[PDB]
Amino acid sequence: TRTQLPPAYTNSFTRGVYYPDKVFRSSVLHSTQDLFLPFFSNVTWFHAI
């Protein structure tokens, strides 16, 4: 009794920002490079209803 439907998609808005390390800083800028979530990406959508 499961009805199957086509997969749906939506957009991300500046998500996936996490403290890349365990070091304190303050009031200052910093450039980092790591495995992130690029902005305005297209994510896959799932319901349970």
Ligand X SMILES: *[C@@H]1O[C@H](CO)[C@@H](O[C@@H]2O[C@H](CO)[C@@H](O)[C@H](O)[C@H]2NC(C)=O)[C@H](O)[C@H]1NC(C)=O
The one of other proteins, ligand X, none whose footprint includes residue 9, by CB under 5 to 8 A per kind, is ligand X
**Does 47 interact with other proteins (rule: CB under 8 A)?**
no
* Amino acid at position 11, single letter: N
**Does 45 interact with ligand X (rule: CB under 6 A)?**
no
Max CA-CA distance within the chain? 56
Kindly tell me which residue out of 9, 13, 18, 24 binds other proteins, with binding defined by CB under 8 A.
24
43 bridge partner residues: 10
Which residue number places its CB atom closest to ligand X? 9
